[PDB]
Amino acid sequence: ATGGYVQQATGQASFTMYSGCGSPACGKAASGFTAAINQLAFGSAPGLGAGDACGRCFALTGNHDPYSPNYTGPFGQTIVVKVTDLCPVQGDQEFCGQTTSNPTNQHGMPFHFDICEDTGGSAKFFPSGHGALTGTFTEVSCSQWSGSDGGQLWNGACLSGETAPNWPSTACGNKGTAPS
Numbered sequence: 001a002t003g004g005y006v007q008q009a010t011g012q013a014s015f016t017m018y019s020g021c022g023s024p025a026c027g028k029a030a031s032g033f034t035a036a037i038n039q040l041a042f043g044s045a046p047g048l049g050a051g052d053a054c055g056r057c058f059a060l061t062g063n064h065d066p067y068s069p070n071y072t073g074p075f076g077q078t079i080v081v082k083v084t085d086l087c088p089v090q091g092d093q094e095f096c097g098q099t100t101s102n103p104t105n106q107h108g109m110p111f112h113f114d115i116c117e118d119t120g121g122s123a124k125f126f127p128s129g130h131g132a133l134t135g136t137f138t139e140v141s142c143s144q145w146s147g148s149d150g151g152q153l154w155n156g157a158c159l160s161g162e163t164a165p166n167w168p169s170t171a172c173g174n175k176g177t178a179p180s
């Protein structure tokens with residue numbers, strides 16, 4: 001995509017959970033299940049505001065625990081998340097360090113979703129005692145997402161991906177250049 005970001009409607013991903021998503025990088029939070037996505041797919045860098053992932057909705061499915069390779073299941077439910085936040089290259093190397101020159105992380109996955117614990121999404125997705133998974137995602141209509149958007153935290157906030165057709169397409173738009 002513009003800026004060299006890697007933005008595809010379906011693919012393989014790793015998954016973790018995090019706390020505190022009330023002031024996210026897209027500049028609006030949301031009351032439903034939300035996630036952060038790795039910088040190379042988010043479409044922006046820290047401090048530059050919303051990128052084109054902002055507001056898009058994705059169905060997530062986990063099917064392996066790389067830290068418990070003997071574990072056969074069961075895994076959690078498929079959930080639909082809205083992306084509101086950025087998982088930056090500098091902040092999390094193991095999971096979100098994909099760059100244009102090295103587009104997979106330490107688990108071989110080209111994408112990563114960090115699922116926000118606050119609003120309930122991680123409790124549906126991760127079985128107890130398994131806080132990191134790999135699996136797949138697919139972009140879906142936000143008709144499949146439940147919740148409502150919060151108010152803008154600053155000018156330029158954007159979740160307009162929530163009404164956009166699936167990638168490839170442009171809604172909030174990418175900022176700057178993807179990490180090399």
Ligand SMILES: CC(CCO)CCO
Nearest residue numbers: 001004005006100103
């Ligand atoms: C679409 C990107 C490729 C990532 O390897 C930008 C090309 O540099």
